[PDB]
Paper text:
Recent findings revealed that TNIP1 functions as a checkpoint mechanism that fine-tunes the rate of mitophagy by disrupting the recycling of the ULK complex during autophagosome formation. The phosphorylation of the TNIP1 FIR motif enhances its binding affinity for FIP200, enabling TNIP1 to compete with other autophagy receptors, such as CCPG1 or Optineurin. Here, we determined several crystal structures of the FIP200 claw domain in complex with phosphorylated TNIP1 FIR peptides and elucidated the specific recognition of different phosphorylated TNIP1 by FIP200 claw domain. Each FIP200 claw domain within the dimer features a five-stranded antiparallel β-sheet and a short α-helix.
The complex revealed that the elongated C-terminal residues of the new peptide were exposed to the solvent instead of interacting with β4 of the FIP200 claw domain. To explore the origin of this flexibility, we calculated the RMSF of each Cα atom in the peptide.
Author numbering:
A (entry chain B): 103 to 111
B (entry chain A): 1494 to 1542, 1551 to 1591
Protein backbone atom coordinates (compact mmCIF):
# COMPACT_ATOMS: atom_id res chain seq x y z
CA UNK A 1 0.00 0.00 0.00
CA UNK A 2 0.81 3.69 0.34
CA UNK A 3 1.09 2.88 4.03
CA UNK A 4 4.82 2.29 3.80
CA UNK A 5 7.61 2.67 1.25
CA UNK A 6 10.81 0.70 0.78
CA UNK A 7 13.84 2.69 1.93
CA UNK A 8 17.60 2.16 1.80
CA UNK A 9 19.33 1.60 5.22
CA UNK B 1 18.60 -25.52 16.95
CA UNK B 2 20.25 -22.16 17.54
CA UNK B 3 18.66 -18.86 16.55
CA UNK B 4 19.84 -15.42 15.53
CA UNK B 5 18.57 -12.56 17.71
CA UNK B 6 19.70 -9.47 15.77
CA UNK B 7 21.29 -8.40 12.47
CA UNK B 8 19.28 -11.09 10.71
CA UNK B 9 20.83 -12.37 7.49
CA UNK B 10 19.49 -14.64 4.76
CA UNK B 11 19.80 -18.21 6.00
CA UNK B 12 19.37 -17.47 9.70
CA UNK B 13 17.23 -19.81 11.72
CA UNK B 14 14.95 -17.42 13.63
CA UNK B 15 12.13 -17.57 16.18
CA UNK B 16 8.88 -16.11 14.86
CA UNK B 17 6.54 -14.91 17.58
CA UNK B 18 3.10 -13.39 17.81
CA UNK B 19 3.24 -9.70 18.77
CA UNK B 20 -0.20 -8.59 19.91
CA UNK B 21 0.81 -4.96 20.55
CA UNK B 22 1.56 -4.73 16.81
CA UNK B 23 -0.98 -7.45 15.89
CA UNK B 24 1.52 -9.12 13.56
CA UNK B 25 4.17 -11.80 13.67
CA UNK B 26 7.71 -10.55 14.30
CA UNK B 27 11.16 -12.05 14.65
CA UNK B 28 12.19 -12.49 18.27
CA UNK B 29 15.03 -10.03 18.72
CA UNK B 30 16.99 -8.14 21.37
CA UNK B 31 17.28 -5.18 19.04
CA UNK B 32 14.66 -2.43 19.32
CA UNK B 33 14.17 -2.45 15.53
CA UNK B 34 10.98 -4.20 14.38
CA UNK B 35 11.29 -7.18 12.03
CA UNK B 36 7.75 -7.89 10.82
CA UNK B 37 7.08 -11.24 9.20
CA UNK B 38 6.07 -10.61 5.57
CA UNK B 39 2.41 -11.54 5.17
CA UNK B 40 3.25 -13.75 2.15
CA UNK B 41 5.06 -16.00 4.61
CA UNK B 42 2.10 -16.88 6.85
CA UNK B 43 0.80 -19.94 4.90
CA UNK B 44 4.33 -21.26 4.42
CA UNK B 45 4.70 -21.24 8.22
CA UNK B 46 1.09 -22.43 8.79
CA UNK B 47 0.08 -19.20 10.53
CA UNK B 48 -3.29 -17.54 9.96
CA UNK B 49 -3.90 -13.74 9.90
CA UNK B 50 -3.04 -17.95 17.15
CA UNK B 51 0.01 -20.21 17.17
CA UNK B 52 2.32 -18.57 19.75
CA UNK B 53 5.67 -19.13 18.04
CA UNK B 54 7.41 -21.02 15.26
CA UNK B 55 10.95 -21.50 14.03
CA UNK B 56 11.72 -20.23 10.55
CA UNK B 57 14.59 -19.69 8.14
CA UNK B 58 15.10 -16.12 6.93
CA UNK B 59 15.00 -15.94 3.14
CA UNK B 60 14.50 -12.26 2.30
CA UNK B 61 14.42 -8.96 4.10
CA UNK B 62 13.16 -5.52 3.24
CA UNK B 63 13.73 -2.16 4.95
CA UNK B 64 10.57 -0.04 5.09
CA UNK B 65 9.22 3.25 6.41
CA UNK B 66 5.64 3.87 7.55
CA UNK B 67 4.21 6.79 5.61
CA UNK B 68 0.84 7.17 7.33
CA UNK B 69 -0.22 7.30 10.97
CA UNK B 70 -2.66 4.41 11.02
CA UNK B 71 -0.98 1.46 9.30
CA UNK B 72 -1.27 -2.31 9.37
CA UNK B 73 1.79 -2.52 11.65
CA UNK B 74 0.42 -0.24 14.40
CA UNK B 75 3.71 1.72 14.45
CA UNK B 76 3.93 5.54 14.55
CA UNK B 77 4.32 7.61 11.41
CA UNK B 78 7.90 7.73 10.13
CA UNK B 79 8.89 4.54 11.98
CA UNK B 80 11.43 2.38 10.15
CA UNK B 81 11.16 -1.40 10.32
CA UNK B 82 12.00 -4.55 8.40
CA UNK B 83 9.76 -6.97 6.53
CA UNK B 84 11.09 -10.53 6.43
CA UNK B 85 10.04 -13.53 4.33
CA UNK B 86 10.76 -16.86 6.03
CA UNK B 87 10.10 -20.55 5.35
CA UNK B 88 9.76 -23.53 7.69
CA UNK B 89 12.80 -24.95 9.44
CA UNK B 90 12.15 -28.63 8.71
MG1 LIG C 1 14.69 -14.95 16.36
Amino acid sequence: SSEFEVVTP
Amino acid sequence: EKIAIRDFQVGDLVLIILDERHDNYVLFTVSPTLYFLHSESLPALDLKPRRPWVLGKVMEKEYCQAKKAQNRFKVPLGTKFYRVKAVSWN
